[PDB]
Design a protein around this ligand. Structure first.
Ligand SMILES: Nc1ccn([C@H]2CC[C@@H](COP(=O)(O)OP(=O)(O)OP(=O)(O)O)O2)c(=O)n1
Ligand SMILES: [Mg+2]
Ligand SMILES: [Mg+2]
Ligand code: NA
Length: 336
DNA sequence: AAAAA
DNA sequence: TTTTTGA
DNA sequence: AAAAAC
């Protein structure tokens, strides 16, 4: 009776994936298209994977794909092949491809993205040992930290670790802004058991423009004094690596944790929370829906109505969804 | 690569 | 067909 | 001074 929407923001996606055989293969094909600079094909496989993640049952025949959007002929051929023998020949070929294997291995280092991974591959590098020991290569400060804390950063962050980090963030923040509201965002807010990092949104109802600007500098200087700041890059947001002492979590005695902090003006806290909760696919479809379906412009700071020529205010995520004409999707339902 | 224009 | 695809 | 980091 009700048709599944092509937009992740109009679907409820919980962590209960009944189609991991299909979505793990589609995620690999998407990743390969990203690497081959085929943005369009990458996005089409990411949307197909996203829609299957929303299904309340596993696909067991081609009839089960009827009425599902984002599944064109190429995607249906991949699903048909997996139904046939439990494997994707297309995803198998990508997993065995030398360029794909090198890109996965190289980008697993913090500070190494698509361009540096492509550069190293075209130079003839295939292993991290050969890259690290090379006498000609020059590494960014980010990459140096990425190699130094590699084992800790490649292991993912669990909930006891995320909670321990939350305590450290809150303790540091209230020291400089006692009325500040600190919220854990990202995957952990969506109910995830693990993550590659821990993200936080910080806002204060009484802080000045200058106080708001200085908070991230004060909090990171405090941690630098404590010898807990392993890496720091302040852009308002900051990308950090913190030293998490084992005793704080309920070998070396500590673990390197990737932490991101975002500071926003109090009146924009709902837009920032919505943008930083994710998932990435849910955020893209929210913005795409706003543009193509409502003629609205949405970002982490505001919502603008082009037709009415007015900014739309929101004190909560629920008010953003209502402005967009969308049913409210809970954070644990945004795992698109 | 799929959907809309 | 061509444009769009988050920003 | 492009890249990585959302
Ligand atoms: N390309 C991206 C990446 C992130 N975000 C927003 C939504 C997710 C939030 C967190 O970024 P990440 O930490 O990379 O996302 P993650 O969802 O938390 O996954 P993980 O738990 O593995 O970190 O920032 C976004 O809009 N676009
Ligand atoms: Mg995260
Ligand atoms: Mg992040
Ligand atoms: Na990386």
């Amino acid at each position: 009776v009700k048709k599944i929407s092509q937009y992740a923001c109009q679907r409820r996606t919980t962590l209960n994936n009944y189609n991991q055989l299909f979505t793990d293969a589609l995620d690999i094909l998407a990743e390969n298209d990203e690497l081959r600079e085929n943005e369009g094909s990458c996005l089409a496989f990411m949307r197909a994977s996203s829609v299957l993640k929303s299904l309340p049952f596993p696909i067991t025949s081609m009839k089960d794909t009827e009425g599902i959007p984002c599944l064109g002929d190429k995607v249906k051929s991949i699903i048909e092949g997996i139904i046939e023998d439990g494997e994707s020949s297309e995803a198998k070929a990508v997993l065995n491809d030398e360029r794909y294997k090198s890109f996965k291995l190289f980008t697993s280092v913090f500070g190494v993205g698509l361009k540096t991974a492509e550069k190293w591959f075209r130079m003839g590098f295939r292993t991290l040992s050969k890259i690290q020991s090379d006498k000609s290569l020059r590494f960014t400060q980010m990459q140096k930290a990425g190699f130094l804390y590699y084992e800790d950063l490649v292991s993912c962050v669990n909930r006891p670790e995320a909670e321990a980090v939350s305590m450290l963030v809150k303790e540091a923040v209230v020291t400089f802004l006692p009325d500040a509201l600190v919220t854990m965002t990202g995957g952990f807010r969506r109910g995830k058991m693990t993550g590659h990092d821990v993200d936080f949104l910080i806002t204060s109802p009484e802080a000045t423009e200058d106080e708001e600007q200085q908070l991230l500098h004060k909090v990171t200087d405090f941690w630098k004094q404590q010898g807990l700041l392993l890496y720091c890059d302040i852009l308002q947001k900051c990308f950090l690596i913190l030293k998490l002492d084992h005793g704080r979590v309920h070998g070396k005695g500590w673990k390197a944790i990737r932490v991101d902090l975002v500071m926003c003006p109090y009146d924009r806290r709902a837009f920032a929370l919505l943008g930083w909760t994710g998932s990435r696919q849910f955020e893209r479809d929210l913005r795409r829906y706003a543009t193509h379906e409502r003629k609205m412009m949405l970002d982490n700071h505001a919502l603008y109505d082009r037709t009415k020529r007015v900014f739309l205010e929101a004190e909560s995520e629920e008010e953003i969804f209502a402005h967009l004409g969308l049913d409210y999707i809970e954070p644990w339902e945004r795992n698109a």
